[PDB]
Design a protein around this ligand. Sequence first.
Ligand SMILES: *SCCC(=O)N1CCC(O)(c2ccc(Cl)c(C(F)(F)F)c2)CC1
Length: 78
Amino acid sequence: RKGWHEHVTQDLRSHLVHKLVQAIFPTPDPAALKDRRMENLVAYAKKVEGDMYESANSRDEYYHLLAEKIYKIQKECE
Ligand SMILES: *SCCC(=O)N1CCC(O)(c2ccc(Cl)c(C(F)(F)F)c2)CC1
């Protein structure tokens, strides 16, 4: 349990999970991507966010390094 974890809400953690999904699929039309397909992307994004949440030593490092991963993915996918 790290000190900075006490100041990060689950709503921020979910928000960054969904930013990772958006980096791969910026137009999440459910006619293009079905229910199980969406759940798979969210499952992978949760592992990526989860690893940063456990390893970061500050709220700034957590947010800015996840933002850097999101932009890296967005570049690779665009
Ligand atoms: S999208 C074209 C690029 C590619 O083959 N990549 C970059 C993105 C991935 O690292 C990836 C794919 C799906 C998800 Cl849900 C994630 C992540 F959000 F990080 F979990 C990453 C796959 C390899």
